[PDB]
Amino acid sequence: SIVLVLCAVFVPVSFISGFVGEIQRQFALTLAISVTISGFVALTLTPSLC
């Protein structure tokens, strides 16, 4: 839910163009790819390591 709710907001704002759009999409994409990977590590690597 955490990963989803964070792609839920940023994935659609990373379709917008413009001065604001190109600025914001630097954040949206970096956050959305990171928190996604961070969920995959927590669903696989984190419990396995523990």
């Binding site: 839910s1 709710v5 839920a8 704002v13 917008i16 413009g18 001065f19 600025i23 949206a28």
Partner: protein, 396 residues
């Protein structure tokens, strides 16, 4: 708390993106239109030493006789490139240095001398602050436009949000014309090409051809080294040969007369326009000034005028209220996904009420600290939908 957010929304001014203290700042100096270069060299040096003994500045470099905007040589204009000490050496921000220097020279009557910081994003403009164009769709003349715009820049400098509004339109430049007696020209029996070439080869510059030396390629120009007191003197000693050997002076058939027009003339988006510039009064936001110039221009200009923004103000006005759509989208998809993932329409409804507390806390702190409603701030608000839901999801 919900309505509190509303009032806090109004209380926060808007901007686009901060205008960093980049360790540099610039100065645009403008002596009265008639002035000669040596008066400008004179006035610069005064400004340049007063600047150089100001606290934060390390060095100062000056392009005297040069228009930083039209990138060309004008003798009554100057441009100074000021550099500040290293950030870990100064006790003063550039926005203070700029404001201090501006208050000082607010009355220097020998020249106009504005101080300005660099643009927020490297290419958005030449200088910081704002730029707009007042366009005339009446058909009016640049001497009429000049008057109208002057009334604006006047009222614009009275507003508490603006500071150092100006306009580059200068139609006061003294300009002499040489009227030609075409009848006297043929009585004296003169080749008119020979006459104009004579004019250029003396008072202006006549380009002949090029040669080559030192592995470079140079021009060959002809100019006059004569010491002429007034202009009517010069026309008496510059001669041109009639077709039948006679040597007529220009004094005869040419008759000098003094009018006054522009030197540069600007159009913007297919209309003749005047180029207004300025910056916001210290402590006021980019959008706060933009709101004030516009308000003034609705009280200073007639229906046959309009204004057209440029650079770091065109962006801000073109992207005004683009904050909602991005924010409202996120809320919808957030609610939809949680509706799905948890098979209830109301479990997301109890997550989605976590966000108003996040935008309350974000507006409260920016308003406490005098910050503004800018792009970086609005992007953070988007992050708080995701991050406050994470807190609500965990309970719900």
């Amino acid at each position: 708390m919900l309505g509190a957010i509303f009032y806090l929304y109004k209380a926060v001014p808007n901007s686009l993106v901060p205008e960093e203290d980049q360790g540099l700042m610039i100065s645009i100096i403008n002596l009265p239109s008639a002035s000669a270069l040596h008066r400008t060299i004179s006035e610069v040096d005064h400004i340049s030493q007063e600047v150089l003994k100001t606290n934060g500045v390390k060095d100062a470099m000056a392009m005297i006789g040069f228009d930083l905007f039209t990138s060309s040589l004008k003798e009554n204009a100057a441009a100074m490139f000021i550099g500040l000490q290293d950030w870990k050496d100064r006790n003063v921000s550039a926005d203070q240095i700029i404001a201090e220097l501006n208050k000082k020279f607010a009355f220097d009557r020998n020249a106009s001398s504005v101080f300005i910081g660099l643009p927020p994003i490297p290419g958005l403009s030449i200088t910081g602050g704002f730029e707009m164009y007042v366009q005339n769709k009446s058909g009016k003349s640049y001497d009429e436009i000049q008057k109208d715009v002057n009334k604006l820049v006047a009222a614009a400098n009275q507003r508490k949000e603006l500071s150092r509004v100006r306009t580059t339109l200068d139609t006061t430049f003294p300009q002499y014309k040489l009227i030609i007696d075409r009848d006297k020209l043929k009585h004296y029996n003169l080749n008119m090409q020979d006459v104009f070439n004579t004019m250029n080869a003396t008072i202006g510059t006549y380009y002949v051809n090029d040669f080559s030396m030192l592995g470079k390629n140079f021009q060959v120009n002809i100019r006059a080294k004569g010491d002429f007191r007034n202009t009517q003197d010069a026309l008496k000693n510059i001669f041109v040969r009639s077709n039948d050997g006679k040597m007529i002076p220009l004094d005869s058939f040419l008759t000098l007369q003094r009018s006054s027009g522009p030197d540069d003339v600007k159009r913007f988006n297919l209309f003749p326009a005047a180029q207004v510039q300025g910056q916001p009064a210290p402590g006021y936001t980019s959008g706060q000034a933009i709101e004030a110039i516009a308000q003034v221009a609705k009280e200073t200009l007639g229906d046959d005028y309009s204004i057209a923004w440029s650079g770091s103000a065109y962006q801000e006005v073109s992207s005004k209220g683009t904050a909602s759509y991005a924010f409202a989208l996120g809320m919808i998809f957030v609610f939809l996904i949680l509706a799905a993932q948890y098979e209830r329409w109301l479990i997301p409804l109890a997550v989605v009420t976590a966000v108003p507390f996040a935008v309350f806390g974000s507006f409260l702190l920016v308003y406490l600290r005098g910050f503004s409603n800018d792009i970086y701030f609005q992007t953070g608000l988007l992050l708080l939908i995701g991050l406050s839901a994470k807190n609500a999801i965990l309970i719900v």
